[PDB]
Amino acid sequence: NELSEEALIQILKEPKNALTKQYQALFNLEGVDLEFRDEALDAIAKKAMARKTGARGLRSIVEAALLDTMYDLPSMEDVEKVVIDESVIDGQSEPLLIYG
Amino acid sequence: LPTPHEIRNHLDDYVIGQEQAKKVLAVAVYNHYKRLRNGDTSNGVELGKSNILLIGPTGSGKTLLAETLARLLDVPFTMADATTLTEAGYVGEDVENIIQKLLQKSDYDVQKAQRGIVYIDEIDKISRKGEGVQQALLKLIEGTVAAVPPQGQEFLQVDTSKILFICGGAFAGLDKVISHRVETGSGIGFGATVKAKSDKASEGELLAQVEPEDLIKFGLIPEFIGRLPVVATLNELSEEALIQILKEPKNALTKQYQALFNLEGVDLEFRDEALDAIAKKAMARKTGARGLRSIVEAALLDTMYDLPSMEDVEKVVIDESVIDGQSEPLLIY
Amino acid sequence: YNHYKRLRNGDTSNGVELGKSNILLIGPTGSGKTLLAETLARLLDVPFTMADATTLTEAGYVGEDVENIIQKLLQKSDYDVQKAQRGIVYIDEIDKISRKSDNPSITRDVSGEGVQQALLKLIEGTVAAVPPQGQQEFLQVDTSKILFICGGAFAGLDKVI
Amino acid sequence: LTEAGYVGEDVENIIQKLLQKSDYDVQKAQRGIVYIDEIDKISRKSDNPSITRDVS
Amino acid sequence: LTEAGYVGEDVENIIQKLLQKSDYDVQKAQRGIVYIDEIDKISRKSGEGVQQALLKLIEGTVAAVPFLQVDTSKILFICGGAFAGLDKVI
Amino acid sequence: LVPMVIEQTSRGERSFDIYSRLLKERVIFLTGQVEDHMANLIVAQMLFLEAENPEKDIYLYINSPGGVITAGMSIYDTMQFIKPDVSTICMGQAASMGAFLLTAGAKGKRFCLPNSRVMIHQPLGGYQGQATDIEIHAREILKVKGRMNELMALHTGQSLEQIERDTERDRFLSAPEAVEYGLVDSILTHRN
Amino acid sequence: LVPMVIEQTSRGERSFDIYSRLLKERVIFLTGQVEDHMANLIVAQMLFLEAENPEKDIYLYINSPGGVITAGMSIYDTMQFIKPDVSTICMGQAASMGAFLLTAGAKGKRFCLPNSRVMIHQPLGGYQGQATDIEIHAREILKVKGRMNELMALHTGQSLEQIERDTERDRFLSAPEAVEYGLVDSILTHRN
Ligand SMILES: Nc1ncnc2c1ncn2[C@@H]1O[C@H](COP(=O)(O)OP(=O)(O)O)[C@@H](O)[C@H]1O
Ligand SMILES: Nc1ncnc2c1ncn2[C@@H]1O[C@H](COP(=O)(O)OP(=O)(O)O)[C@@H](O)[C@H]1O
Ligand SMILES: [Mg+2]
């Protein structure tokens, strides 16, 4: 059966090798812990469904939304957490960098 | 490994412009190699690849940009074309030929081959009404176990799930597709916007806003688009951009000739006015950055052919008329 | 589960031959057909391999042959015929070999109908001659107890139904 | 099966298999039986023009 | 010369024969020119692979016999040919 | 005879008519006498363009000496009914019916070429029969005249009395004059 | 009928009609009486060519005995509006309307065949009705005549007074005479 918005949301976190988990480990190497809000994943599914990209589109959507986020972290230390919000997907907002 | 800034700094040294594209590759390469080195991932998760997609007109520095990444690292690099590839059971070749050139370049080393990178050019021109080549190439992406003969007899097979695939091509007409989606669909008419000024930023700006739906209209199979999550856009070299290419790049065209000229105690002053004419000629013939070498070569061949004929030469001065061919650079003594 | 029982019962300790049943995964493109095959290989105790139908072609042509599928299986089984004769295979893009609106058969669809004809004896079971490695020996591998899964998108099949 | 001189399997391969069942005994193999399944597939494509040799 | 992997002809004999005429001296050997004639006959439009086979020794290669593995960074590989069909391509 | 054109696209080659090719660009041509048959063709094109993309403006080129009023109103209502803005451009001439449709375009999108004639006049009609029937048709034509004058005033911005006085008899207005009168918004003389 | 021709290109062999084939090379034919229907056809072709390549000149072959002034003005406005230069070539003959469009081409790109004939005359019209409405039409034709003469003088380069004197009655100009009068820039006799 074709995947729906609800299915995409589950596939984003439920799978052991989910897209969200893969990025979390990538950020863990640098030391920062990445967290994905429930609303953020919900908007991700809506964008993928609109573009007809499906599950494969999830990786492209996250890549563009986190490109700038991971472009400074390797050389920008002192960060401890990077919260992701629905607005971040649209591009209006920016990652809520946390220091500690 | 070097941070994205370090990679970008190296790119800026050998590349002028395409700041947005450089950021994508800097992050992409950093993540791709980071995943390879950290195969364990500190958990049971199996990190997946993020193939890259480059969109830009001819002579946009795509090959040079990709070459810089390979040259920076100590891994192999290979190039290929999509027009040569065909379907199975036809006179044309198959996608497997791409892996054939990767093993040879990698010295038949599985470890060194996996860390390597491969580039594809002319990704377009094989869209719907043709589709078979995409299906054949769709297997290589996402992972395969293709086998190649050794010592070119265990037929060493290299996995294609850890190799980065960078697809580049010159999409002709994609700007119009994006225009309708991102602007008014006026096309022909008194109230339309005809591209008569040769705007060099319109295409770059429009292409930067490309979306998957635009690629679908172009003819690209949705599955193929999905295999390439990362997308980068490159703008066409404008008049001002070409001028910088002659002096700003580390191994610039002028620097190469200046080094050869100063080797014999002869200065080579490239007049700023002559540089614009050189760039203008390239745009006139649409030869791109590649034509730059030929333009300067001819202008310097006569000058460098007589310079050693006489002694005491102190300096040379290239001028506007020299590029046109109606004058010779005055020699100092 | 049924395949393991057949393998454990390979000695035919009964009055039947325990024939096999092949699966045909017809799912919409992007639903995870390939994922179900890769994930299945992480817990399989028998050799498993994947293949593409677009590369396959009828015998005697430049394209790939159907017997090449078994060649990949031997590598996973350490080139053991005994272990390779009880493995699993997952054919992909099986919807591309379908006749391209050429039922009259004006020309032989080596990439289409021709592939199906060669696979008829492979799915049911036939002693195929696989290359020694990859023609002097032509190793004989029996595909009577090998399961063959076929996955495709079948774009447009909804209209027919 | 395919015509001689091509990558495809040759017709003579059928006798080779028969010999294996007879322990490579020419006298025994000269009196056996042979079955050729899917004979309808090698049927010539009458509609197809007689331009390209139908090796298959 | 044949394509990479072929056993009909040796593709590395060009770097080897050069040293023979250079009295097996690295300095003398890495000072001349190596003219590879008829390069267009193998150029594409199997032939394409030959170009890559030659590229193995054109740059970044150490292959010589007294195995001496002498570099070829200085050897000038002047490839010549008639390029039948280049006029119409241009 | 209409010449054929080819549209080169990455997907493939395609052939179109001279008018069909411009239709894809949201351009509609209004030429010749206005009638129900030609009017329906224009209405169908407007409906088709709205379905394809209801957020893009539609360009309508008007060059006709006028025609039936019912056929013309069928187009005027369609322009207002569909949410996309219908830009009107006058080429050659724009008579009563043509001028009415020219000024019916979205505000700020009504254009006219430098050398173009615009004529506005009261509706023309006629009926023969019994005196009772004459009154019915006479009153109906008068109502149409008043209704059209009201619409002209709304689009042009002129007063009702001014429109009636100017529309009593044929009034030819040049492109510059049409701007002041409000029939059009600007004049397109060259492409910038 | 219209013969069909085959064009060789990278994609393959494509069938084109004689007129459509020449349209690809930016060649437009203006034959027969000038009317709204044929005028719009030429306008559509000019706009189509502008979008395809706004930097390449457009060639317009004029062979007509005249026609409606409004229909011809639509072509004139389009020629001046589009950025690409329009080259006008006179074949056979060029009457008042045809001559006006012939001289409306880009300065220096107007040509005429050696045996072509060019004739220029004042606008022709007429109206039947009351004395008040006829005065309106009688006054409008004069405005068109004045505007037509002004444009003719601007393109030809001669004084407005001279154009009026020569345009009062039919005046036939040969290919060489048209050059001196300013209606054409040069004469094409052979391909070099
Ligand atoms: N920014 C640049 N600086 C120097 N050279 C460049 C630049 N961009 C392109 N080139 C030249 O162009 C060639 C590669 O072009 P390529 O990337 O293949 O263009 P495309 O990918 O658009 O066909 C190189 O030989 C290089 O010298
Ligand atoms: N039902 C699903 N559950 C989890 N992931 C899925 C699912 N369907 C598709 N995917 C995603 O799609 C990618 C592989 O797609 P693939 O299986 O090749 O598509 P198809 O089934 O059309 O061949 C994987 O990265 C996977 O995360
Ligand atoms: Mg799949």
- B196 CB within 8 Å of a chain C CB: no
Cβ–ligand 1 distance for B16 under 6 Å, the answer: yes
Report the C-alpha gap between A95 and B292 in whole angstroms.
43
Structure tokens given for F153: 């005033």
Residue F121 bears catalytic tag: yes
Which 8-state DSSP code applies to residue B78? Answer: E
Q: Whose CA is nearest to atom 9 of ligand 2?
A: C32
Q: One of F74, F121, F166, F174 is an active-site residue; which one?
A: F121
C-beta separation of C122 from C128 below 8 A? yes
Cβ–ligand 1 distance for B59 under 6 Å, the answer: yes
Cβ–ligand 1 distance for B293 under 6 Å, the answer: no
* Cα–ligand 3 centroid distance for C19 (angstroms): 28
Which residues in chain B have Cβ-Cβ distances shorter than 8 Å to A25? 38, 41-43, 45, 47
Which residues in chain A have Cβ-Cβ distances shorter than 8 Å to B227? 56
The C-alpha of B105 sits at a distance from chain E's nearest C-alpha, in angstroms, of 8
Proportion of chain D in helix, strand, coil states, percent, rounded to 5: 30, 0, 70
> What is chain B's alpha carbon radius of gyration, rounded to the nearest angstrom?
23
Please indicate whether, in this complex, the C-beta atoms of B194 and F9 are within 8 angstroms of each other: no
Structure tokens given for B151: 């010592």
C-beta separation of G66 from G100 below 8 A? no
Report the C-alpha gap between C74 and C76 in whole angstroms.
5
HSE-up of G34 (CA within 13 Å, CB side)? 28
Report the C-alpha gap between C33 and C26 in whole angstroms.
8
Report the C-alpha gap between G104 and G88 in whole angstroms.
8
- B189 CB within 8 Å of a chain E CB: no
C-beta separation of B69 from B117 below 8 A? yes
C-beta separation of B57 from B65 below 8 A? no
Closest Cα partner for F177 from F69, F90, F61, F65? F90
Q: Report the amino acid identity of residue G4.
A: M
Please indicate whether, in this complex, the C-beta atoms of C134 and B155 are within 8 angstroms of each other: yes
- C56 CB within 8 Å of a chain D CB: no
- Closest-CA residue of B relative to C62 is B89
Which residue among C26, C31, C33, C35 has the greatest number of ligand 2 atoms within 8 angstroms of its CB, and so is best to mutate? C35
Please indicate whether, in this complex, the C-beta atoms of F11 and B129 are within 8 angstroms of each other: yes
Q: Report the amino acid identity of residue G79.
A: M
Give the helix/strand (H/E) hosting F7: strand F4-8
The answer to whether the Cα torsion of B304, B307, B308, B314 is positive or negative is: negative
- C10 CB within 8 Å of a chain A CB: no
Which residues in chain A have Cβ-Cβ distances shorter than 8 Å to B50? 59, 63
Is residue B233 marked as binding?
no
Using a 10 angstrom Cβ sphere, with 0-12 exposed, 13-18 middle and 19 or more buried, the burial of residue B39 is exposed
Q: Give phi and psi for A38, each to the nearest 5.
A: -60, -45
Report the C-alpha gap between F165 and A63 in whole angstroms.
67
C-beta separation of C3 from C87 below 8 A? no
Report the C-alpha gap between B203 and D54 in whole angstroms.
51
Report the C-alpha gap between B68 and B78 in whole angstroms.
13
Q: Is G135 helix (H, G, I), strand (E, B) or coil?
A: helix
Give the helix/strand (H/E) hosting B195: none
Of residues G23, G74, G143, nearest to F91 (C-beta): G74
Please indicate whether, in this complex, the C-beta atoms of B186 and F12 are within 8 angstroms of each other: no
Closest Cα partner for E49 from B98, B115, B75, B156? B98
- With a CB cutoff of 8 Å and minimum separation 6, the contacts of E86 are E40
Residue F45: alpha-carbon gap to chain centroid: 14
Resolution as reported, in Å: 2.6
Which 8-state DSSP code applies to residue C65? Answer: P
Using a 10 angstrom Cβ sphere, with 0-12 exposed, 13-18 middle and 19 or more buried, the burial of residue B42 is exposed
Report the C-alpha gap between F31 and F33 in whole angstroms.
7
**Buried-state track C36-53, b at ≥16 Cβ within 10 A, e below 16:** ebbeeeeeeebbbbbbbb
Please indicate whether, in this complex, the C-beta atoms of E5 and B101 are within 8 angstroms of each other: no
B150: left (phi over 0), alpha (psi -120 to 50) or beta: beta
C-beta separation of B243 from B275 below 8 A? yes
Report the C-alpha gap between C60 and C137 in whole angstroms.
19
Give the helix/strand (H/E) hosting G30: strand G27-31
The answer to whether the Cα torsion of G126, G127, G131, G136 is positive or negative is: negative
Which residues in chain B have Cβ-Cβ distances shorter than 8 Å to C58? 89
Q: How many degrees, rounded to 5, is the angle at CA G112 between CA G107 and CA G116?
A: 150
Using a 10 angstrom Cβ sphere, with 0-12 exposed, 13-18 middle and 19 or more buried, the burial of residue C137 is exposed
C-beta separation of F3 from G19 below 8 A? yes
- Map out the domains of chain G as residue ranges: 4-187
With tokens 């990679």, the residue in question is B7
Closest Cα partner for F117 from F90, F143, F83, F136? F90
Of residues G19, G70, G80, nearest to F3 (C-beta): G19
Q: Is G175 helix (H, G, I), strand (E, B) or coil?
A: helix
What is the DSSP pairing of strand F117-120 with strand F171-174?
antiparallel
Between the two ends of chain E, the Cα-to-Cα distance in Å is 28
Please indicate whether, in this complex, the C-beta atoms of B219 and F22 are within 8 angstroms of each other: no
3-class secondary structure per residue, F54-117: CCCCEEEEEEECCECHHHHHHHHHHHHHCCCCEEEEEEEEECHHHHHHHHCCCCCCEEECCCCE
Of residues F61, F65, F188, nearest to G81 (C-beta): F188
What is the DSSP pairing of strand B267-270 with strand F58-64?
unpaired
With contact defined as 3+ CB pairs under 8 Å, the chains touching A are B, C
- With a CB cutoff of 8 Å and minimum separation 6, the contacts of B95 are B85, B133, B136, B137, B139, B140
CA distances from B137 to B97, C99, F142 (A): 11, 21, 73
Residue numbering of the annotated binding site of C for ATP: 28-35
- C93 CB within 8 Å of a chain B CB: yes
Closest Cα partner for G104 from G123, G124, G118, G125? G118
Closest Cα partner for G118 from G149, G101, G93, G155? G93
What is the DSSP pairing of strand B117-121 with strand B267-270?
unpaired
Q: Whose CA is nearest to atom 21 of ligand 1?
A: B62
Query: What's the full length of chain D, in residues?
Result: 56
Cβ–ligand 2 distance for A11 under 6 Å, the answer: yes
- With a CB cutoff of 8 Å and minimum separation 6, the contacts of B202 are B175, B195
Please indicate whether, in this complex, the C-beta atoms of A56 and C28 are within 8 angstroms of each other: no
Q: Report the amino acid identity of residue G93.
A: Q
The C-alpha of C98 sits at a distance from chain B's nearest C-alpha, in angstroms, of 13
Q: Is B233 helix (H, G, I), strand (E, B) or coil?
A: strand
Using a 10 angstrom Cβ sphere, with 0-12 exposed, 13-18 middle and 19 or more buried, the burial of residue F49 is buried
What is the DSSP pairing of strand F4-8 with strand C147-152?
unpaired
Which residues in chain B have Cβ-Cβ distances shorter than 8 Å to F109? 191
Domain count, chain C: 1
C-beta separation of B207 from B178 below 8 A? yes
Using a 10 angstrom Cβ sphere, with 0-12 exposed, 13-18 middle and 19 or more buried, the burial of residue B48 is middle
Query: What's the full length of chain A, in residues?
Result: 100
Report the C-alpha gap between A58 and B230 in whole angstroms.
11
Residue F96 bears catalytic tag: yes
- With a CB cutoff of 8 Å and minimum separation 6, the contacts of G117 are G92, G93, G94, G172, G173, G174, G175
Q: Whose CA is nearest to atom 9 of ligand 1?
A: B61
What is the DSSP pairing of strand B52-55 with strand A96-99?
unpaired
Locate the ligand 1 atom nearest the alpha carbon of residue B252 and give its number: 4
- With a CB cutoff of 8 Å and minimum separation 6, the contacts of B130 are none
> What is chain C's alpha carbon radius of gyration, rounded to the nearest angstrom?
16
C-beta separation of B121 from B169 below 8 A? yes
With tokens 């199997």, the residue in question is E46
Give the helix/strand (H/E) hosting C142: strand C139-142
C-beta separation of B172 from B58 below 8 A? no
Residue B291: alpha-carbon gap to chain centroid: 15
Report the C-alpha gap between G100 and G119 in whole angstroms.
10
C-beta separation of C147 from C20 below 8 A? yes
Architecture of domain G4-187: Alpha-Beta Complex (3.90)
Which residues in chain D have Cβ-Cβ distances shorter than 8 Å to C127? 17
Q: Whose CA is nearest to atom 20 of ligand 2?
A: C30
Please indicate whether, in this complex, the C-beta atoms of B135 and C57 are within 8 angstroms of each other: no
